[PDB]
Amino acid sequence: HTRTLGFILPDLENPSYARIAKQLEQGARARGYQLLIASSDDQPDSERQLQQLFRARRCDALFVASCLPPEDDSYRELQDKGLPVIAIDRRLDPAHFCSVISDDRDASRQLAASLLSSAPRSIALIGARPELSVSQARAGGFDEALQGYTGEVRRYQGEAFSRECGQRLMQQLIDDLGGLPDALVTTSYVLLQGVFDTLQARPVDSRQLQLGTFGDNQLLDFLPLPVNAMAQQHGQIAATALELALAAIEEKRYEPGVHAVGRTFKQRISV
């Protein structure tokens, strides 16, 4: 026993992971545990390197937002050797791992529906890493809200949750529609940032779409362009994950399954 917990996350610059990591560290500290954080940069080989690191380090439990393929069984190996693995944000196999996540599919359905109110002629989804369960959920909720929709629908899912990817996809979208869509949902705030870059390159008067995104940002309150946002309850995510970790460590309780926490709706678009 080391009384240390590890957290592998995809991106240190993603404010949601930072917030969760901070909430975890605080809660852990009150329980007598230290938190060690490492970033995979959403690269599968980096994550595998971190796996070996946290195993040799002998952390009492490992929190992880994985970027690995579901076919990969590396975490099963670690678990079989006695390491408690708690998934965060990105679910691991519900038959073998405990995961704490946001209720993304329903969040996405409401998000898209909130834009559909204005009767848009065209609507698009911009996302990334389509293979991930988190991405499938958000694309899934988006489709669900489109039932009975007769307008133009486009889905663009890039290679990374990055600003530049969002910028590239927005361009490709604009180039493909011959203009802005009436409405747009981004599956991640960082992707929205790229969208803003693309919009800024255009003349001032062609930038008036209905916008919705996952995650949130304070400065959205000051944007002339209103953006609806679905934010994580980071505090509850961390508190749930930690309690699950400690039960596995201290009570040897561990039940596979997904624990979903609702997102909060931040509406800035007048309805």
Q: Minimum Å distance from CB 199 to its own copies?
A: 8
Structure tokens, 187:
């599956």
**Taking phi first (over 0 means left), then psi (-120 to 50 degrees means alpha), and beta for anything else, what does residue 134 get?**
alpha
User: Phi and psi for 62 in degrees, rounded to 5?
Assistant: -125, 120
Residue 25, interface with its own copies (CB under 8 A)? yes
Residue 44, interface with its own copies (CB under 8 A)? no
Residue 57, interface with its own copies (CB under 8 A)? yes
Task: CB nearer to its own copies: give 152 or 221.
Answer: 221
Q: Minimum Å distance from CB 12 to its own copies?
A: 4
Using CB under 8 A, which residues numbered 179 to 198 contact its own copies?
A: 193, 196-197
Q: Are strands 264-266 and 227-231 parallel, antiparallel or unpaired?
A: antiparallel
Task: CB nearer to its own copies: give 29 or 121.
Answer: 29
Residue 268, interface with its own copies (CB under 8 A)? no
Residue 41, interface with its own copies (CB under 8 A)? yes
**Taking phi first (over 0 means left), then psi (-120 to 50 degrees means alpha), and beta for anything else, what does residue 100 get?**
beta
> How far is the C-alpha of 182 from the C-alpha of 67, rounded, in Å?
32
DSSP per-residue string spanning 206-230: S---EEEEES--GGGGT-SS-EEEE
Stretch that binds its own copies, among 32-40, 74-82, 101-109, 150-158 (CB under 8 A): 32-40
Angle (deg, nearest 10), helices 234-250 and 15-30 = 40
Residue 239, interface with its own copies (CB under 8 A)? no
Q: At which residue do the structure tokens 């919009």 appear?
A: 199
Task: CB nearer to its own copies: give 120 or 166.
Answer: 166
Applying CB under 8 A, which residues contact its own copies?
2, 4, 11-13, 15, 18-19, 21-22, 25-26, 29, 34-39, 41, 46, 49-50, 53, 56-57, 163, 193, 196-197, 200, 217-225
